[PDB]
Each structure stands twice: as structure tokens, then as C-alpha cells.
Structure 1
Amino acid sequence: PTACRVCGGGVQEFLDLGRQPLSDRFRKPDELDDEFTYRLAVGRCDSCEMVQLTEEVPRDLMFHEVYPYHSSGSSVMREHFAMLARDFLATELTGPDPFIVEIGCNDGIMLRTIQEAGVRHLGFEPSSGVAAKAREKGIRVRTDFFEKATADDVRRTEGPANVIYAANTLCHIPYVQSVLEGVDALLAPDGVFVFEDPYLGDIVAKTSFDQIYDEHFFLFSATSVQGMAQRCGFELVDVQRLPVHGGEVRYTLARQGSRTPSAAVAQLLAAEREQELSDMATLRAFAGNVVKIRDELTALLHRLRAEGRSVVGYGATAKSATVTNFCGIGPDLVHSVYDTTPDKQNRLTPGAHIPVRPASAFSDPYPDYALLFAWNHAEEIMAKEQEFHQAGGRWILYVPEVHIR
């Protein structure tokens, strides 16, 4: 039985996705077929209701020099984060000498807008290759994990931060207590710690189990985040639901009693409690639907092969590692996955070993079907690939249900 990373309570498992590889390791075709594996399973803490994995992968195995995810590969997410930055610049960073720290700045997608406004900032990005992309934009970055000690070091030399922001990063961090202690050390007394990550409500609603993989340790909800804040000295004071990444919530934490929570916080809490979001029965129902999706997706893929129709995938997401390894999908059923990230191209997907090719290679003559792993980017992708669909090529989706369109 595993101890909750937030409160030490007991965590009860509800979903076992089996042996999985690291999601963001893309091997050259000639490399030895040996990968690190671990058991991917998800549970819910009994005391604070935090939904979390039952095995941690060590951080250095995931985040390192060759971490391959480039945030700026999505035009939607570029606009999303530039607007968030402008919003901070108009609200929380209007002082005489403001400072914003970003945990997980990646290639600089959000901090470039802060740097272009002349505002003092620091990104923490432990994956040095993408850190260097951000530095080439003029962004100040430390190639370090944010945790208590490194936060202590920044408070000592740089002073208090008015905003600490994390997007798609806090959920990646099992040592959230250490992060919160760092935020306590580093945040101004009237500052905010704002983070946005995939939302448990949307994952349950859409059965989007591919949001569960090595790098997604936590599936936050307003209920669990409220408890986490409270148990660590802070207070959930705003929440905002966002469409990006399959559905997220952006949570705003402040020092306790310093600000009054928006009505939105109580409203979302009440909705989660009404829909019994975090009840073990709800979470096990989700687990049953995950199995139903596996069985229908494999049945379809095998039917398509028996009917002589060609199938590829689109988007070498980290998420897809869960789909192809839980479902047992490899190159005999999906022959290639198309992806815009150079560091992923001419490599093989983890565990399943499907070849990855540049997106520019998805062109006439098109395959009959494309399994859309980057389903959270559907609109942006389909807008760039109208020729495929006009030629009669169709998308296979597995969220919220297996269907073709």
C-alpha cells in the first residue's frame, strides 16, 4: 500500500495500466531493445482525496538533457501562454520591481512575453536542451528542478516573487510538499502561486486515460488541490477551467486569508461533490470504461487491417505511450506516427516501437486512416491537414469513445 505524497494517508488503487516504458524516450531504430519499465497504476488517497500514481519514476530518468517535448510546437498553446503572460503583466506584476518565476518553462513559450515586457523573471527548466531554446530568446533560466532548496537559493539572491507559475508541470512532480515549501520560501506575502494541469473532472468525463503516464503523477481536482493548499499553508482562491490539453483547471493559491476565494471555487467544489467525482466508485467506473475503450480500439484496428485499410498515427505525444503499451498496438497495426518534433523523428515510439516520421511526410498518397494521438490538438492539426480529409482520409479518435470521422 502506498503513502500519499501530499498528506501521508493511504492510497487505494483503482486502475492498473500494466508495465509501461518511459513515455518520452524515442530510440533510434538500431538501439538495443532494452527500456526502463515500471508499473503504471493510479489510486486515490483516503484522507485528502488526491488521485496519484502508485509508483514514482525517478525525476532524472524523465527530465534531462534530451527531454524531447517542445512546448512551442503548438500555435494554440503559444497564443494561450502569451495571453496568460499579458494578463499577469496587467494584474499581478504591476509593481515597481516585480518578479515572476516559472516552474517548467521549457522552450520559453510563456516567459518570452515577460522578457519582452522588460520584467525581471526566472525560469526553472531541468531539461537542458529545451532550457537552451528559452535562453536563446533572452530568457533567464536555471537548469535545475524547482524544489525547496533551489527556491531558497533564488529567494536569497533575487528576492521574493510576485507570481510563481507552473503549467503542465506541477502534476509531473511527486515531491509537491518540497515544491510548496519552496513556494512558501520564495513567494511574496501578497503573491500568487498559479498552476494549470489536466483536470480529473475532464479525464473521468472523457475517459481520457492517456493523460495517465510516467510524467503525470497527479490528477488534480479542486477538492484535492483545496486540501493540498490548506495542509501546506496556502488557500485555493480562484479556479478557472481551460480547454487546452483535453481539459484543465488553473488553480490560484495565495497565503491563507490574504485574499477571499472567488465564488468559482466553492461552485466547482460543489459540482465535484454533486457528481461524486472523487468517489472510489466513480473512479472505478472510469477504470471499467478504460478497458472498454482498449477493447474497442484494438478490435477496430484489427478489423481495419483485415479489410486491407492502411492506418498511421498522428502526434508522438507522451500520452500515446500509454495507449500503445496498454492496448498492445505496434507497427503491424499502425505503421508510422507523424510528428513535427525533430528530436522525435527517425526514432521509434517507446515500448511499441512504431517509427516516427516528420509531419511533412503525411502527404499524398495518404493512408486510409490516422489514429489521432494528439486529440487535444485536434482543431490545430485538422486545420493544417484539410487535404488528407478531402482526399477521403479519416481520423480515428479514442476520446471520448472510439469513433471515426
Structure 2
Amino acid sequence: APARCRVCGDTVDEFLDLGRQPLSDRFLTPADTDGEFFYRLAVGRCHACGMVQLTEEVPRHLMFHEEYPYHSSGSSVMREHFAMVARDFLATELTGPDPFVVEIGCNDGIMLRAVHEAGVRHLGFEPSAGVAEVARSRGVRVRTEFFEKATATAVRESEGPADVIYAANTMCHIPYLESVFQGADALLGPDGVVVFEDPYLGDIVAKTSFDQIYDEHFYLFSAGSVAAMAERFGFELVDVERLPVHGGEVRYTLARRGARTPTEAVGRLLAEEREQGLDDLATLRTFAANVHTVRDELVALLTRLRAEGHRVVGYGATAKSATVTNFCGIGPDLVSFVCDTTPGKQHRLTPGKHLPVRPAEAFAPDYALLFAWNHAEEIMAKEQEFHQAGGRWILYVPEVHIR
């Protein structure tokens, strides 16, 4: 029997079943292995409001806790991006004599750092206690708390109204959006905005990039779903922008209903989504057929390659890759190990399928399976050596192909 929509409570129509999955970032020490968590990863569309979402939630505190392993400042290009975000806010929203910006999911303080440094009052919400502490050491004010209604309301009471509430790669992790927006209601000034950027459903379908579907991406936002969501909560979609990062995102700007005028980009994106059928169950079924084809093809290839004695190695032990390995039944018998630059992932086995993770230097095989497809260019150039040697790259986004 079907899931209830986490926004409006109506029935969700499941369109893709990705099977039993581990938590995407629980890399196993061989010393433990035993009590590995699995859940059923599948995706559906609310029948009333069209919000695309997972049909089983992972409990928030099993993902967001004291050992949260994703550190934002690992990425130089993401450090640059969030500096730019900070500068953009200071030029446009945080222009007053004593403004205030709240960030949901501030992580190691990669964006709020630049706001603090501009002398602007701020507060991060970061429930993962470890990274929260990194943000604090860097001067950012942080509450080690989940942003929701009550926690947002107590910040209003002690610190006054916010001009901006920002969330980057965070809103799609939070099923309880109503509580989030009751929080925003309490906390924003009359003209304030909620601004969030997350993986975009349009790019997922166009690219068949189904490895964007894993535990921490409860929602696959579009302009259409976000607009309806907003409307339900007394908000309004007033700006949108497409971002190239993390495989394709949109940054959505909401204000309170009737408070701001929507930009021409909003209507434009809404019409694009409409003519492309992005709101149709039927389109999402085509996507799921395309995903099955990718699986069929990727498996057939890897098995052909093993029968012919070609060694295959994985490149990039991405959080996304968990979905591909578990969905495709790819274990050590089809890919011997995965090269990764993160030392907290090395000396360990990948979530669910338990591929050994070895350092980058281990790379120098006949074929390399490129899991970090969103950094393909960078990777293939760094490793020209390999492909000069007759090495070949198997990619599965947007299709199974070799290069």
C-alpha cells in the first residue's frame, strides 16, 4: 500500500524501485561489517501536489549526527561558489545597517564565514555536531540543532527577524518542509526570502542521472512542485536560477504570498517544465524505463568484460555510487576496487556492495568505471596517461558508453 506525501498527505505514485540500499556514506571497516543498515530506496510522485519524493524516509538522526562525514570545504570550487553566494547576498538582500541571515545546513561554515567576515549578523543551524564545531572554530555562530518550527521560533525571539534563510544541498534532505516553512514564517521579516539550491529534477530526467537518488535526497525538486509547495504554506515562488554544480541544480527564491513580484525566469521555467511534460507521471515512467536500460546495459558490459578477462576498476567512491552499485548488483566480482582521494573512505568497503576502497595511486587496468561523472573532464585530463596506455572509461551518464 502506498506512501503518504510528506507535503500534503495525499497518495504518492511510485514510479521507480531502486531496491535495498545502504546509507550512502556509511563506509564499512572490515573489522565491523555485521549490522549494516538497509532501507528500500524508491521514488514516487504525489498524486495531488506533484512533489517527487522517496517512498521510505531514512530517520534523520541516522544520517545527521556526530560522525557526519561530508565536509563542504573539501571542494575549492565549492569554496569559491559559496564566497560568491555570500557576496551576492551582501549586494542584494543584506544591504541594511544591521541585517540578519540564517543558514540551514551550514556544515563547516563555508558560506557563513564570508558573512561573519563582512560584519553581518548570522546564525547557522547544523545538527551534525562535528561539522558544527568546525564552523564555530572558524568564527561562525552555530546552533547544533535541526531547523524546524520550534527551533526557528526560539531564534526569532532571541535574535529578531531574518532577512534571508538560505539552504544549499539541504532542503531536499528534509521531509518535514511544513515545519521548515512554519519556521520561516516565524523567523523572516515581512520582506524576507527563503533561498535554497538543490539537485534539479529536470537535469535528473534529461541526463538519466538516477544515482542522484539516494538516502539524503528525499526530494527531487522542480519549479512546478516548489511553486505548489510554497503556495500551500503561504509562500510564493519569486525567483529561480539554474546552477551547473553537483550535476545540475536550481536555486529557488520564495517570499511570503503577495510580498514580492515573481521574476520572468519563474514563468519561463514553469512553461519549459510544462511543455517538456516534467509534471507528467508518464514522463517519470520514461525516465524509469531509461534507468532500467542503463542498468541492463551496464550489467551486460561488465559481465562481457569479465568473461574476456578485462580488469575493471572504479573511479570516485561517490555517495551517489552506492545507488548504482546496489541497484546494478555490482560487487568485487565485477569491479575489483574503487580509487578515491578521501582517506576516511580508504582502508574501507563501499556501502552495501563492499568494493574495496584504495588510494588514487593504486589506479596504475583495461577499463575504469567513472562514478565521479560530474567531474569527468577534470578526471580524464589528470589521467591522460591511463587512456594513452589503451585504458578505456565506462560512463553511465547520460547513457552507457565508452571513451
Q: TM-score range by the shorter chain?
A: over 0.9
Deviation at 1:381, TM superposition (A): 3.5
1:260 matched residue in structure 2: 261
The residue number in structure 2 matching 1:47 is: 48
Alpha-carbon separation, structure 2, partners of 1:380 and 1:90: 32
Distance 1:161 1:377 in 2: 36
Q: 1:354 to 1:230 in 2, by over 3 A?
A: same
Residue 200 (structure 1) aligns with: 201
- Equivalent in 366, 376, 379 of residue 378 of structure 1: 376
Give the aligned partner of residue 93 of structure 1.
94
Aligned to 1:65: 66
C-alpha distance in structure 2 between counterparts of 1:9 and 1:85, whole Å: 38
Query: How many matched pairs?
Result: 402
Please list the CA deviations of residues 165-213 of structure 1 after superposition, one character each: whole Å capped at 9, or x if unmatched.
Answer: 1111100111111111111111121111100111111111111111111
- Following superposition, the deviation at residue 384 of structure 1 comes to 3.9
Residue 319 of structure 2 corresponds to 318
Q: Is residue 329 of structure 1 aligned with residue 327 of structure 2? A: no
CA shift for structure 1 position 80: 1.5
Map 1:166-315 → 2, pairs under 5 A: 166-315=167-316
Cα distance, 1:388–1:131 mapped onto 2, change above 3 Å: farther
> How big is the shift at 1:136?
2.6
Q: Which amino acid aligns with 2:235?
A: F
Query: Residues 353 and 122 (structure 1 numbering): CA distance in 2 closer, same or farther, change over 3 Å?
Result: same
Paired position in structure 2 for 1:369 = 367
Alignment check: 8 A CA contact 1:316 1:349 kept = yes
Q: Which amino acid aligns with 2:324?
A: V
Q: Deviations over 1:37-96 (max 9, x none)?
A: 111111101111100111111001111111111222222222222111111111111111
Please, which runs of 5 or more residues in structure 1 have no aligned partner? none
1:327-382 deviations in Å (ceiling 9; x for gaps): 001122222222233322212111010122233x245xx23332221212223434
Partner SS, residue 228 of structure 1: helix
Deviates more, 1:323-332 or 1:391-400: 391-400
The whole-number CA distance in structure 1 between the counterparts of 2:91 and 2:148 is 28
Cα gap change, 1:187 to 1:387, in 2 (>3 Å):
farther
Extract structure 1 runs of 4+ deviating beyond 4 A.
none
SS of residue in 2 equivalent to 1:399 = coil
Is this contact kept in 2: 1:68–1:344, CA < 8 A?
no
Separation (CA, whole Å) in 2 of partners of 1:318 and 1:199: 17
* Contact 1:73–1:340, Cα closer than 8 Å, also in 2: no
Q: For the residues of structure 1 that align with 2:119 and 2:79, how far apart are their CA atoms?
A: 19
Mapped to 1, the partners of 2:197 and 2:135 lie a distance apart of 20
Does residue 1:357 correspond to 2:355, yes or no? no
* C-alpha contact 1:103 1:124 (8 A) present in aligned 2: yes
Give the letter aligned to residue 206 of structure 2.
A
Alignment of 1:8-23 (within 5 A): 8-23=9-24
AA aligned opposite 2:156: R
> What's 2:103 paired with?
102
CA-based RMSD of the aligned residues comes to: 1.5
AA in 2 matched with 1:202: D
Q: Which amino acid is the alignment partner of residue 37 of structure 1?
A: F
| Between 372-381 and 237-246, the greater mean CA deviation after superposition | 372-381
* Deviation for aligned residue 1:140: 1.7
SS at match of 1:3: coil
Give SS of 1:188's match: strand
The one-letter amino acid of 1:34's match is: G
- Residue 401 of structure 1 is aligned with which of 380, 399, 402? 399
In structure 1, how many angstroms separate the alpha carbons of the residues matched to 2:54 and 2:100?
Answer: 33
In the alignment, structure 2 segments of 5+ residues that lack a partner are none
State yes or no: 1:135 paired with 2:136: yes
| 1:113 alignment counterpart | 114
User: Structure 1 residue 318: deviation in Å?
Assistant: 1.6
Structure 2 CA distance for aligned equivalents of residues 23 and 239 of structure 1: 29
- Cα deviation for residue 271 of structure 1 reads 0.8
TM-score (norm 1): 0.95
Which residue type is aligned with residue 338 of structure 1? Answer: C
Contact 1:76 1:380 in 2 (8 A): no
d(CA) in 1 for partners of 2:252, 2:229 = 12
